[PDB]
Ligand binder design. Structure first.
Ligand code: F43
Ligand SMILES: C[C@@H](OP(=O)(O)O)[C@H](NC(=O)CCCCCCS)C(=O)O
Ligand SMILES: O=S(=O)(O)CCS
Ligand SMILES: O=S(=O)(O)CCS
Ligand SMILES: [Ca+2]
Ligand SMILES: [Ca+2]
Ligand SMILES: [Ca+2]
Ligand SMILES: [Ca+2]
Ligand SMILES: [Ca+2]
Ligand SMILES: [Ca+2]
Ligand SMILES: [Ca+2]
Ligand SMILES: [Ca+2]
Ligand SMILES: [Ca+2]
Ligand SMILES: [Ca+2]
Ligand SMILES: [K+]
Ligand SMILES: [K+]
Ligand SMILES: [K+]
Ligand SMILES: [K+]
Lengths: 442, 548, 248, 548, 111
């Protein structure tokens, strides 16, 4: 092993599942469940057959409020969804009985599609998923109804929108969790451009699962970005484990102890006591009636602090059952813990900084929005390297209905399709079992 | 009757228009031209003042060995030298673009839902009117909440304002009419009812930011500027905390969830934000042009007003400056809106269709394309052959290709009622023209036309799109003059023939039906003539804040 | 918990505001009805509006975190999230903007606190906000001359005082009466007139302001002289710098 | 001596600056202000003319319950109301940006190699002069090869031209001097020899396209417009075919291989092409500012002229319009260039450094950062405490944070001669300020400052960069006022202290050392005052082609 | 590094020069970079010197792309591994390390 650290792994009810698992068994580079989740998200597409049908019958194609009078086509797509889906599958697959899926939902109104892995082996990136899916469904629909050459371009518009006049698939009736590569803030960012509401919807608002899926995506991106290479790798692995995988039951136990009456401040006090009990920090020197704490392990202090940050979000936004204050928790958990201890806050100030901007851009005229529309690729919330967005996912999971731009509003198509996939919906048990499987290979 | 271009040809030349011979070289060179003479003198003055040589007729080759022609702006009696139709020299052309660039459409539907469902407050016609009075103070750059704010000079930003429209007549009539685009007044009955049915109970703002700001900055400024002042006016008018969590919902709604940009952003090689010309799809350009609601008994006039709008914007400003620059592409564009030439060819094609099929009654098939596009192409080319003065007028093959194919494509679409078969006719015209004269356009003119036939009906990712949704960023179309404005015309043609109130976006159609614009979008060619004569008054000038 | 370093009175006051075990001094009595009036979110006797159904009626999924985290009462009821906002004069108001946000997230549950130079805000469920606001208004968080309840037009934290010792308010929500020596709240926090003004009592005297304040100033206690507090800030700067470079 | 801001405070207020009490509410509201009175009347005239309400003082809250202050433009004796420093109201500010936006630097080194190595023709100072005469005719939009070209009006484009520079003094002197930026004349001896050694035998064009075009279009137009007319002038001057295979090498060279844009393009969320403000790195902004070559015995003056340049461009035009809009961010920026406040704090810090370390002689270490940034931060904050009038002047915490940290950062960099430790000092200042007053800036002010310490010396992909290379698109910096222009100052500070001729790009430094620019980049604050007074004459106006 | 010519054409930061014998120590730098670039020892990572140490061929291990969305891990992982290897080879100070980053990856992320 490169690192000697071991962690105990728990389920989302706080029960011990695996003891003393090597840290690297949770690494995105090693853990086969993380690989399966990431590959799955790359290759999965939601197809709105009802939406395609309605766009065609009204000629409302090419984006908001657009319509071409005289171009209407009345096709019974939903009524013929089985045949269309089977025809599309024949085009999407590489070989019969490979890992292609095309599965109807909602009585034929939607389809879940998983494009075969073999197509991505010989692709540079991930756009084959929507593009292969789109043309397979365009062709299948044309063939189902013998749509004429003169009219077929309307089927194309109904499926993929204004592309390529627009750079995006503007008005498309397919959806993915990922967004187009051109919209990346930086190379390596693609797993960060996944809306918080999509993660929350997919995990059915289960708080710990939403946090886990978000942390998996964020910290996996940190590897793709090169941020978790060399000196920084252990910091990112310990963050993944303690903040998003409830390592050592620390998040769970902090929430248990602070859930009935607690505040951000009371979670801080318990976390600092635990860090001291476990030897992660110690008193370095004494000022007047003030103890200055130090650590010989900044990455582990950071990870403990990150666990407390997650617990503080769950306690504060959980008590309100309202997500908006997550921007405040992310700021003042970190501000308070520095002046409580004399140690640096989570991500060495970058969570606090992210929180400052996020607070501003969720309470002001200038941009942003509610917590659910942010993501790791958003200019407001890209700055912390994986330690902020998972708290936003937890907070939105806990929201009882205070948001206009809720997951129900923004993410219904994604919810219907992506929540079908067990590993997307409930990733934590899969990642924990996979860690157990490979523990002796580390 | 005489061909529609005969008056223009008689004005331009000494010889009768059918004569094959003329006189060159003894015409006085640049001295034959009032405008070139103005330029020579101005160049001398410029160089003397700044100490660096500038315009000099003796550089390079000597202009005016042939006649330097006047051009008739089509549908007008105005004749001007071509330099007066250069976008740099024509304030009307500049203001057409500024009026598009500085406009965004922003819903109030999500905003009103935030107020009602999240804040728990009422929205009424009265609260909407109070909001509109507020935002018409704020939008040009003035304060409503903070102390010690410094503000834009109202006279510099007099062109900035906000209006609303809705399909619900009873709501529209209860809002102060100063702030309402009156669909029933601006549109004839059937068009008004179509448009109101599209909008329904929705309420939409048309926001125009100041020209002086749009010129200082860029198109991508518009929706941001709009949203800031919408946001401030929501705070002031609905009396909420001046910056609370719900404030972010108004921001997201105004900047993203219910905004309609005029143009979408462009990819890196031609990097640009929103509301730049390359992002404006052909169907939006046809809907911005307001010929449809005034000239609705003449589908040729409507279609060719759209062509003029697009030829100028897309070839002169967009391709000729944003994407290149210099002397640029004035006459590649003027070919499509001068001397009543495209008008002659297109009225011919419309008559052919009316006699053979009836408007909108031809089969939507390749047989129809082959028939109409071929016949109209041959008519147009015959005119250049029968009238040597015409051929010397539209001297560049590209100009001729665009004009002949525009007439062929529009005519085909008049017959089918479908823009896609119109587009197929445009490409067939190019192929026929190329074989007839053993030439077509400039070196790179027919990239998109050679790819064209195959991509008209394609359904593949970056190939397949109805013409209305295409624009200057459609891959094949991204580079070359003499196509984009003509495609906007073909997009318009079947809808004009059908009597449709709009081509692609009814909100865009309504948003430019507004007497408070600076440029008159109902009469684009009339405005180009006014600008050529130096009679157009643009917004955005700095005279008030500079020395007298 | 130790909250904040330093040996000045300012530092101790900062610790006291943060410490939920420190019982804030009650300086004035403000009735429940007058808190609701000052807030301006609903009329007295108006039932609480609702942004969503009570938690019992909107069927949350099975979730150990939900089971362990007790919702505040206004969350149980589906109350709107509403706000109270204060401006604090740099001329020795007792509370100051970061002091408030730090203190609020130590003392209060379910809180969205925001800090700005000229305004500081808390957003929480309406009936809970009312209880918090009673404390914010009755105790030494508040002085009616050097602090102001302001939901908009907040200018004043950095302005000179008027001849009565009152902070500037563009909308004059708080009026000093020379004849009584008391401040009256004549408008609610957004600036709308109250049919019946609220007595906020007497402003604190100048020496008491200096005793209670959490701002450092050269004409009070200067930050540069509280060397232990400066040391910790510099330490944080250095350790953040190191960690960002290499945390190994 | 008196602190440098005392005169301004005495001019602004009735009370002496140390007084803690004043009078409010009885000042007449907006009627106290000449400028607000002008605006109220103009709003009424605007509304009457157009039939839509516009500026109205009775909307929202009532301005002027306190004194509406005049501002001294620092280093001048000009006092103006803040509205006169709004970029919309200030033609000098608009022209500063236009002069940057419309400029590109284009090498002739690849071009001359194509001529010699591919075409087989000689390049000499005489052929270069002939080429420059040609391109100074062509660049503003005039023809050199084709017949029947229509051209831009020379008087509308009088501000467009091309000059060259080279480090080779003999070549430079053999080219007609009308076309040459004379490095030896424009720069003091030491700086001139540095700059000539950087350029060496390279020959570079400075191309300025017309302001009227830049305003009609965008920044990404500039290098394209430049390249078209370079291309035409190469054809005319070196007598090749007017469009052969070699023509493409000149295009690629001018558009890509030897072009220097002022700004690089931006990512999609803030999509923009080249030569927009967000793409201009802090080191280029410092080099565009020309204070360095005239005020070279006063590093404070040089650094704070850069701060003025950047605070205006980056906060008022870029963040305050391109990225938002409305009333905008005038006073967030004016805090950094008015009332001699930042000047007082920075001269204090410079003297502390000279006394304790000597300029550029301090260890480049965190110990130096802790010393200087702490001392200067405490001095600046003490001034707000000692002078209630100063605190009421810079009433927003963000303004104060930016000003105090700018002095702290610049002072640290004066001592170390390294911008990175200067930057660390800026962040430490923020942290100390926040603890001293229990406040800092607006809601979102310190996103980048909280991330700041950890990212100063980071080496990770999107974190690590020397300050000179950072700019408005550095991720932490992409959103917020009160930082970017100050960072340009910190970038300049160590180089000013060292006596370096440039900060990051010597070609950019030389390119703005040109008396044929419209805006005077040697005296940015003087120009802002001139514009505030409505005494600045911008380029790009349309009066010549519009009614009188 | 030795000229401080970083961040794009014709750019230079006077005073930031660092004179490091990178090519002379290329074997050690390459080996340190390889340790960071690989996922496991003897996986399909390659770091091979060319041109007498003036150039290196790098192949980033396939396993990193199995859990990546696209391909940018190749330059980004390579860049930071070489930046860190160079810093460690010469004990470059915290104060100067940002120049090594600029020399390897340029003006990113401002560009
Ligand atoms: C509504 C917001 C929330 C938001 O998203 N932006 C606002 C308002 C916005 C508007 C105000 C225009 C108007 O009054 O109609 C504009 C001008 C931006 C625009 N839309 O053009 C602006 N702020 Ni604000 N805003 C400013 C500032 C500030 C300071 C003012 C504190 C004080 O004590 O006066 C505080 C933040 C803080 O407390 O630090 C602030 C808040 C706020 N700012 C509060 C309103 C505060 C109030 O109710 O009074 N701004 C400043 O600190 C100075 C610069 C000033 C900006 C205008 C300029 O630069 O000239 C203006 C910048
Ligand atoms: C955040 C982002 O907005 P969105 O969340 O994408 O709407 C971004 N605006 C800004 O960064 C606004 C910056 C200028 C105004 C605030 C200055 S502190 C933009 O419009 O691209
Ligand atoms: O001659 S080319 O076809 O290259 C250009 C025509 S403008
Ligand atoms: O009050 S906010 O900080 O949101 C905006 C300051 S302009
Ligand atoms: Ca097992
Ligand atoms: Ca005649
Ligand atoms: Ca000539
Ligand atoms: Ca009706
Ligand atoms: Ca009516
Ligand atoms: Ca009717
Ligand atoms: Ca005085
Ligand atoms: Ca007012
Ligand atoms: Ca000389
Ligand atoms: Ca010399
Ligand atoms: K209503
Ligand atoms: K512009
Ligand atoms: K309720
Ligand atoms: K020499």
């Amino acid at each position: 092993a490169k690192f000697e650290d071991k962690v105990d792994l728990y389920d989302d009810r706080g029960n011990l599942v695996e003891e003393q698992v090597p840290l690297e068994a949770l690494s995105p580079l090693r853990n086969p469940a993380i690989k399966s989740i990431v590959q799955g998200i790359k290759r999965t597409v939601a197809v709105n057959l009802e939406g395609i049908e309605n766009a065609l019958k009204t000629a409302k194609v090419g984006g908001p409020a657009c319509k071409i009078m005289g171009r209407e086509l009345d096709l019974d797509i939903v009524g013929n969804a089985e045949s269309i889906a089977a025809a599309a599958k024949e085009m999407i697959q590489v070989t019969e009985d490979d890992d292609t899926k095309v599965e109807l939902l909602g009585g034929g109104k939607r389809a879940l599609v998983q494009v075969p892995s073999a197509r991505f082996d010989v692709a540079a990136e991930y756009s084959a998923a929507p593009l292969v899916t789109a043309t397979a469904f365009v062709q299948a629909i044309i063939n189902e109804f013998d749509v004429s050459m003169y009219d077929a371009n309307m089927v194309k518009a109904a499926v993929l929108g204004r592309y390529p006049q627009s750079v995006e698939y503007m008005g498309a009736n397919i959806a993915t969790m990922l967004d187009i590569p051109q919209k990346l803030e930086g190379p390596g960012y693609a797993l960060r451009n996944i809306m918080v509401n999509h993660v929350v919807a997919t995990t059915l608002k289960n708080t710990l699962q939403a946090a886990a899926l978000s942390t998996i995506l964020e910290q996996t991106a940190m590897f793709e970005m090169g941020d978790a290479v060399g000196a920084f790798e252990r910091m990112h692995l310990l963050g993944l484990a303690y903040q998003g995988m409830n390592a050592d039951n620390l998040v769970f136990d902090l929430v248990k102890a602070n859930g009935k009456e607690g505040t951000v401040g009371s979670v801080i006090a318990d976390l600092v006591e635990r860090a001291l009990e476990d030897g992660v920090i110690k008193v370095e020197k004494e000022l007047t009636d003030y103890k200055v704490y130090g650590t010989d392990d900044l990455a582990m202090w950071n990870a403990y602090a990150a666990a407390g940050l997650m617990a503080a979000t769950m306690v504060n936004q959980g008590a309100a059952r309202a997500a908006q204050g997550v921007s405040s928790t992310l700021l003042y958990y970190n501000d308070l813990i520095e002046f409580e201890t004399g140690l640096p806050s989570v991500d060495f100030g970058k969570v606090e900084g992210t929180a400052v901007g996020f607070s501003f851009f969720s309470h002001s005229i200038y941009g942003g929005g509610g917590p659910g529309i942010f993501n790791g690729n958003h200019i407001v919330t890209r700055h912390s390297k994986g330690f902020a967005i998972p708290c936003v996912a937890a907070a939105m999971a806990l929201d009882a209905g205070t948001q206009m731009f809720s997951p129900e509003a923004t993410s219904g198509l994604i919810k219907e399709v992506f929540s079908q996939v067990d590993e997307f919906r409930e990733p934590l048990k899969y990642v924990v079992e996979a860690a157990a499987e490979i523990k002796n290979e580390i | 009757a005489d061909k529609l271009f005969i008056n223009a040809l008689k004005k331009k030349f000494e010889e009768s228009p059918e004569e094959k011979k003329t006189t060159f070289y003894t015409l006085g060179g640049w001295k034959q031209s009032e405008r070139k003479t103005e330029f020579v003198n101005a160049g001398k003055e410029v160089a003397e003042k700044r100490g660096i040589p500038q315009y000099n007729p003796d550089i390079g080759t000597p202009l005016g060995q042939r006649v330097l022609m006047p051009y008739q702006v089509s549908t007008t009696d105005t004749y001007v030298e071509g330099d007066d139709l250069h976008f740099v020299n024509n304030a009307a052309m500049q203001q057409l673009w500024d009026d598009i660039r500085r406009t965004v459409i922003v819903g109030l539907n999500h905003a009103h839902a935030v107020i009602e469902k999240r804040l728990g407050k009422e929205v009424t016609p009265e609260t909407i009117t109070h909001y509109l009075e507020t935002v018409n103070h704020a939008m040009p750059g003035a304060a409503v909440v903070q102390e010690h704010m410094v503000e834009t000079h109202p006279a510099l930003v007099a062109d900035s304002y906000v209006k609303v429209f809705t399909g619900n007549d009873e709501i529209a009539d209860e809002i102060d009419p100063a702030f309402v685009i009156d669909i029933n007044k601006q549109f004839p009955e059937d068009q008004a009812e179509t448009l109101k049915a599209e909008v329904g109970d929705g309420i939409w703002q048309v926001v125009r930011i100041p020209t002086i700001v749009s010129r200082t900055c860029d198109g991508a400024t518009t929706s941001r500027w709009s949203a800031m002042q919408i946001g401030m006016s929501m705070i002031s008018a609905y009396k909420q905390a001046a910056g609370e969590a719900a404030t972010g919902d108004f921001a997201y709604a105004a900047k993203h969830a219910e905004v309609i940009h005029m143009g979408t952003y462009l990819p890196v090689r031609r990097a640009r934000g929103e509301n730049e010309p390359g992002g404006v799809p052909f169907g939006y350009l046809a809907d911005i042009c307001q010929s449809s609601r005034v000239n609705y008994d003449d589908p040729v006039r409507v279609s060719l007003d759209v062509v003029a709008t697009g030829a100028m914007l897309y070839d002169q400003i967009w391709l000729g400056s944003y994407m290149s620059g210099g002397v640029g592409f004035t006459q590649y564009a003027t070919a499509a809106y001068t001397d009543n030439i495209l008008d002659d060819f297109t009225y011919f094609g419309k008559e052919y269709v009316e006699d053979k099929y009836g408007l909108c009654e031809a089969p939507n098939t390749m047989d129809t394309v082959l028939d109409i596009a071929t016949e109209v192409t041959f008519y147009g080319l015959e005119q250049y052959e029968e009238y040597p003065a015409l051929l010397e007028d539209q001297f560049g093959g590209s100009q001729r290709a665009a004009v002949v194919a525009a007439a062929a494509g529009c005519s085909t679409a008049f017959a089918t009622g479908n823009a896609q078969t119109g587009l197929s006719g445009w490409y067939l015209s190019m192929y026929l023209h190329k074989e007839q004269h053993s030439r077509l356009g400039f070196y790179g003119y027919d990239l998109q036309d050679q790819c064209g036939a195959s991509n008209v009906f394609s359904i593949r990712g970056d190939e397949g799109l109805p013409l209305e949704l295409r624009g200057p960023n459609y891959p094949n179309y991204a580079m070359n003059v003499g196509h984009q404005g003509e495609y906007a015309g073909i997009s318009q043609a079947p809808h004009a023939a059908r009597g449709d109130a709009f081509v692609f976006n009814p909100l865009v159609k309504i948003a430019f039906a507004d007497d408070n614009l600076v440029f008159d979008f109902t009469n684009v060619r009339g405005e180009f003539a006014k600008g050529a004569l130096r009679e157009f008054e643009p917004a955005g000038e700095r005279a008030l804040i500079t020395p007298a | 918990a130790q909250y904040y370093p330093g040996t000045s009175k300012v530092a101790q006051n900062r610790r006291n505001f943060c410490n939920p075990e420190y019982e804030l001094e009650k300086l004035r009595e403000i009735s429940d009805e007058d808190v609701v009036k000052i807030l301006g979110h609903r009329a007295p006797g108006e039932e609480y509006p609702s942004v969503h159904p009570p938690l019992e009626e909107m069927d949350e999924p099975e979730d150990a975190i939900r089971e362990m985290v007790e919702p505040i009462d206004g969350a149980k009821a589906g109350d709107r999230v509403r706000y109270i906002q204060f401006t604090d004069s740099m001329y020795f108001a007792p509370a100051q903007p970061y002091v408030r946000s730090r203190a609020y997230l130590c003392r209060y549950r379910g809180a969205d606190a925001g800090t700005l130079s000229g305004r500081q805000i808390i957003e929480t469920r309406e009936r809970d906000l009312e209880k918090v606001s009673k404390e914010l208004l009755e105790t030494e968080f508040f002085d009616p001359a050097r602090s102001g309840v302001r939901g908009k037009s907040v200018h004043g934290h950095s302005l000179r005082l008027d001849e009565d010792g009152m902070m500037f308010d563009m909308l004059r929500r708080q009026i000093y009466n020379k004849d009584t020596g008391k401040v009256e709240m004549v408008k609610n926090q957004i600036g709308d007139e109250l049919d019946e003004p609220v007595d906020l009592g007497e402003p604190l005297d100048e020496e008491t302001l200096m005793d209670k304040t959490t701002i450092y100033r050269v004409d009070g206690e200067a930050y540069r002289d509280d060397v232990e507090a400066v040391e910790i800030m510099q330490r944080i700067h250095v350790l953040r710098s190191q960690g960002g470079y290499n945390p190994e």
